[PDB]
Amino acid sequence: PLIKENMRMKVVMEGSVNGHQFKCTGEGEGRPYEGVQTMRIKVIEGGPLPFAFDILATSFSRTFIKYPADIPDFFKQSFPEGFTWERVTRYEDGGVVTVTQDTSLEDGELVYNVKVRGVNFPSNGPVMQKKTKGWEADTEMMYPADGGLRGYLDRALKVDGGGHLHCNFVTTYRSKKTVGDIKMPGVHAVDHRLERIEESDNETYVVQREVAVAKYS
């Protein structure tokens, strides 16, 4: 298989949030059939970011979901061509993010190119004030939609002081493999748990780890 029990990934991100432009690079590794991955991320342009890195965390990896044998794995079936995704996210206090992503396989390694654009984050809110403390575990509902998948997520960003800032996003995943070559799964869910492992220098260096497991709804 093109997706081995050990896989490395590289990512390049360009983005802007409230007009602040930035660039990130990441590299990491994981076990795609165990649903575990780790990534080391550097803000190489525009740092230190004037907003919480937490809002970028989920734009940095769908090949590393543990799928039971009975649930078709849309993402692992997509190679060698790979897949793309597009995401729209809204925070309850006004922020809106659009993200587009391309996933390819180059010299046996996964390569991600991502574009992030966020607007209307309140200057007094926890994101622009950098008063966030990582994400709670959450669950994505996955639905088949015209040869691809559509995912729905309600999320909770922990805030300093004990509260949560809520957001939700919808993602459409599309294969670059000609339709008709992939067994489509039915409705299912994906449990996610993303933790910040380490960070340095005003959040311009970040290490994160994610565990993701698909299951029946």
Side-chain angles (χ1 to χ4, degrees):
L2 299 118
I3 303 305
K4 302 183 77 76
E5 294 206 8
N6 295 286
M7 288 298 287
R8 300 185 187 90
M9 65 266 313
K10 296 170 26 223
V11 54
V12 168
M13 171 187 291
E14 290 174 16
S16 95
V17 173
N18 281 19
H20 187 94
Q21 298 180 37
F22 58 88
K23 187 169 185 173
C24 296
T25 60
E27 53 90 22
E29 70 277 324
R31 302 275 290 161
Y33 300 91
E34 293 171 40
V36 178
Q37 61 182 309
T38 292
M39 199 180 287
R40 302 164 287 277
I41 305 151
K42 305 175 187 183
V43 181
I44 61 155
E45 300 186 358
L49 306 176
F51 56 82
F53 187 89
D54 279 326
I55 66 166
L56 303 181
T58 59
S59 305
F60 288 102
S61 190
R62 316 294 299 193
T63 305
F64 298 82
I65 295 159
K66 175 170 173 169
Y67 266 83
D70 48 346
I71 301 174
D73 187 327
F74 181 83
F75 308 99
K76 289 182 183 75
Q77 292 183 79
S78 276
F79 297 85
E81 290 92 351
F83 57 91
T84 62
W85 55 262
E86 176 149 12
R87 182 169 292 153
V88 53
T89 302
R90 179 166 188 272
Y91 290 77
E92 62 180 320
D93 68 349
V96 174
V97 189
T98 290
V99 182
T100 55
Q101 201 262 21
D102 175 278
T103 297
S104 304
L105 189 72
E106 312 191 356
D107 292 336
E109 186 175 344
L110 291 150
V111 179
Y112 307 157
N113 281 95
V114 64
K115 292 188 188 191
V116 175
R117 173 165 299 259
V119 295
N120 305 336
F121 285 80
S123 66
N124 51 266
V127 168
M128 297 308 291
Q129 294 297 310
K130 284 178 83 142
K131 271 83 164 290
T132 65
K133 294 159 57 163
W135 295 95
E136 303 278 7
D138 47 31
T139 302
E140 183 177 15
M141 285 301 309
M142 302 292 298
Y143 292 94
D146 175 60
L149 294 182
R150 189 153 282 138
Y152 285 101
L153 256 162
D154 298 315
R155 322 187 63 225
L157 173 60
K158 297 188 271 189
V159 161
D160 300 319
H164 294 87
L165 179 65
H166 303 277
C167 73
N168 69 90
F169 65 61
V170 47
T171 312
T172 302
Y173 311 90
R174 298 190 179 272
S175 171
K176 275 130 70 178
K177 193 176 263 62
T178 326
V179 298
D181 305 347
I182 294 169
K183 193 176 166 87
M184 287 299 291
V187 61
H188 61 284
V190 175
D191 285 338
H192 296 277
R193 184 168 43 80
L194 191 155
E195 299 180 334
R196 166 96 32 106
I197 298 307
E198 164 189 359
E199 61 194 89
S200 294
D201 260 297
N202 301 132
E203 250 183 3
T204 59
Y205 180 69
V206 171
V207 183
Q208 42 186 59
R209 180 185 188 262
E210 191 203 284
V211 178
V213 176
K215 66 184 186 176
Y216 286 96
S217 313

